[PDB]
């Protein structure tokens, strides 16, 4: 049951992980990220799971809190918990291995204080162990939400509501089709070659 994970870095300090199992491959990958960017990832999880105010406290004007309520509102934790548990043994070891790999180097920080980053001293708080739920959330918060959750309908409705007040339903909806057109100009720039 004992597996060895050989991690090797190149000239530019880029890690190359060698393993045989799904759990081992992302253990060394998790270990390498912890060595390079420990504070960046600790602040990454908090930005997408909603625990920024726990260590940074309140902002000049509840900026870290008001936002912390916005991120928690976007997702539901119960829906994701089922999705992770539904995955197979080899599929779960990708996220668990990443969590255990990150915690491996994190536990070594307590042993030797010289490995602790400067940012933890300035902001004055201790690092936290990463979970498999956090690893998924780092992807869902930045990927799918900031690129596949872009919504601008409620502001478009308020503009059409305001235009229909000043110009009526005849001219207001006519001017709305010029500012926010339903279909693009029939000759735009597309990726596939037309005709």
């Amino acid at each position: 049951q004992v597996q060895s994970v050989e991690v090797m870095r190149d000239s530019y300090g880029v890690p190359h992980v060698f393993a045989d199992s799904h759990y081992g491959l992302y253990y060394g990958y998790g270990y390498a990220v912890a060595q390079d960017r420990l504070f960046q990832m600790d602040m990454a999880r908090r930005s997408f799971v909603g625990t920024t105010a726990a260590v940074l406290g309140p902002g000049e004007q509840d900026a870290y809190v008001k936002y912390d309520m916005q991120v928690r509102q976007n997702f539901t934790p119960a829906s994701i918990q089922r999705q992770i548990a539904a995955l197979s043994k080899d599929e779960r070891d990708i996220f668990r291995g990443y969590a255990d790999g990150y915690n491996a180097y994190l536990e070594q920080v307590r042993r030797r204080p010289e490995l602790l980053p400067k940012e933890y001293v300035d902001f004055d708080f201790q690092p936290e162990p990463l979970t498999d739920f956090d690893v998924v959330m780092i992807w869902v918060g930045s990927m799918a939400n900031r690129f596949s959750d872009t919504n601008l309908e409620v502001t478009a409705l308020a503009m059409r509501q305001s235009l229909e007040k000043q110009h009526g339903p005849e001219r207001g909806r006519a001017l709305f089709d010029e500012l926010l057109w339903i279909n693009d100009t029939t000759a735009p720039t597309t990726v596939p070659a037309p005709a």
Partner: protein, 551 residues
Amino acid sequence: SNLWSTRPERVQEGSTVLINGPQFGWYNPAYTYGIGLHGAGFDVVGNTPFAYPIVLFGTNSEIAWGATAGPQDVVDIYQEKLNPSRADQYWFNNAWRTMEQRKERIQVRGQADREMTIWRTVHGPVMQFDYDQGAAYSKKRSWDGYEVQSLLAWLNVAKARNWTEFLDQASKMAISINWYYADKHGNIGYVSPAFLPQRPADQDIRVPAKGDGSMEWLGIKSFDAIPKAYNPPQGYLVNWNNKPAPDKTNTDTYYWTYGDRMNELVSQYQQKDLFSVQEIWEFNQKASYSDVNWRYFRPHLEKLAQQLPADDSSKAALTMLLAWDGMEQDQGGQNAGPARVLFKTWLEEMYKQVLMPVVPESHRAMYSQTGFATQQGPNPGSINLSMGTKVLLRALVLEAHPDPKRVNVFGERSSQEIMHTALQNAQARLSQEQGAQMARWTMPTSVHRFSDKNFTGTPQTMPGNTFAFTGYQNRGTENNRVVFDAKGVEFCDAMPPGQSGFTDRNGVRSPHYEDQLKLYENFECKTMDVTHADIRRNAQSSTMLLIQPQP
């Protein structure tokens, strides 16, 4: 985010070259992390944003892959008709329905724990409450419940070896994104995987749908509806956040027109027939400093000077603006030439004459902005044609091609009249600002910045720890190049400022903190070890880990 793929038939040495430049904004430490995963079925090399177990940009020695921002609609907002007596009840079908609520506890350092309630409808979670209107806006998402499925489908695409194994993994994707294909054989492909919903004809795509049961999704559209392009007759695939494919309507968030930033890369392809690998890499060189909204206004400025009488009223700067190649030129800086400065203030006056009278007070800031790069002001990770510019372009064609069903925003005044008045107002503004002398006019050159705080507004490092250099580049946060020669696999990437984001307790930083910053500035590129042979030869340090898990 820009990507341009080339087929060996359009390349001199005959090698498949895929270059990607995903722009999320420039941050310290680096947004992307480089990794090479080997074993357990995986044999990949490249880099990925944040720290995801998957690899967004890289190659597996068989096929490469890129990515861009999703150009398709997956998120719809429904407005529920609230009960005039009770706030928690909404009209859905028949008759009233009670909202579900869950309590989240926010932990705050130094203060007591703050508690809030999140309401939920049949569609999804609510975002905004309007009590005086009696309507609540809920957010229903097509990719909801398929978060891990889209994560794993992006992961298993690394194990793929052909186009058929690339396409079926895209069928599992629920979130809106663009994927790109390039093999060693010489084939290039494109697909835009997304769980597209089939909306009724009553529903308007730009405004929220009726949340009463009358206006609901008929179902998820088939995979045949998803746009896909494999090996175009032209021999290249270009995408810079543009339109996916012709036949797809505009989304609620993205709106496109004939004037698009894509033309900055494509125009370079209609010059020579065959390009070398070094030349294709130098496409990013020009596209970074070139102006986005210049190609479309220049022909509309040529008919100005003439037959316009040479009575010098004004025609002073108008004849000069023509000698502009549409490029940022540093000298101090301080932009070398008063051409960009005059063109910037001209567009700003064009919004005042045309758009501001018709656009309401609330959404006035959305059209008043010119969308130009600046020195001090917080500029986005990607420079674009502003929504104010886009309306001006497509209505400028409306005068050339009249339509009774549509309304012209120019109205009484012609194109030549307004463009002249804006030119007079731009010159009058700069005469009192930088003097009457035209040649001495200049604007501060835009500074390319690496902010310590990420996109979401959370400090990644200590305040003040920022990198900055003069000359804003319209590139990606990371630039990768995969060349498939006759050998034939060569991966080359560049990510500022470096790999390691480590800072010691004393204050000294890692040797791999600034090693890629200077290389990125000069449009250069670093070689990355791909195969098992040369990785053991070009290794700097090796560390073996020991694991003992319980199956």
